[PDB]
Homo-oligomer: A and B are copies of this chain.
Amino acid sequence: KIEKVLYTGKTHTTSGGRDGAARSSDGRLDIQLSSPGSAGTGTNPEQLFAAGWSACFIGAMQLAARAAKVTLPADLAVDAEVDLGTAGNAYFLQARLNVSVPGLERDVAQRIVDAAHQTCPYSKATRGNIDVDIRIA
């Protein structure tokens, strides 16, 4: 249970079927949507979740690196994949985050990635409910 609310992201999302749209309250996000894998030019929940988790993960890595007095490489990146899949009539997500951290000693890099996976609120939100493979790539 949150004690202090620091920021609220607000969106309005519409759909006419296969194609839709989502716009944030402040216009920062203004995107078209199309069903994942369909013919549409819009994005989808899997791409959105991959982007959002990856961003939050990098921020958590930066926090951890500060606490450890470690400088992260300029070329830090996360290549994420989020699958939609089924078992029977039931749908699930699963995720892979491949962290690119060139220049850091193995142990140092692993400690930072491990701290991030512990502190990242998206990682906390999904803990124990979906499979998540975090690797240094």
Which residues from chain A sit less than 8 Å from chain B, CB to CB?
Answer: 1-17, 20, 22, 24, 28-29, 31, 33-37, 41-56, 58-60, 62, 74-88, 90-94, 119-122, 124-131
A37 to B59, CA, bound (A): 13
Contact at B81–A9, with CB atoms within 8 Å? yes
Q: List 28 A-B contacts (CB under 8 A).
A: A1-B85, A1-B87, A1-B92, A1-B94, A4-B85, A4-B86, A6-B83, A6-B85, A9-B46, A9-B50, A11-B81, A13-B58, A14-B58, A14-B77, A20-B58, A29-B31, A31-B51, A45-B53, A45-B56, A45-B59, A45-B121, A45-B122, A48-B52, A90-B119, A91-B119, A92-B124, A93-B121, A126-B126
A130 to B125, CA, bound (A): 6
What are the 9 closest A-B residue pairs judged by CB atoms, nearest first? A9-B46, A2-B85, A48-B52, A13-B54, A9-B47, A22-B51, A45-B56, A29-B43, A11-B50
A31 to B55, CA, bound (A): 11
A35 to B46, CA, bound (A): 21
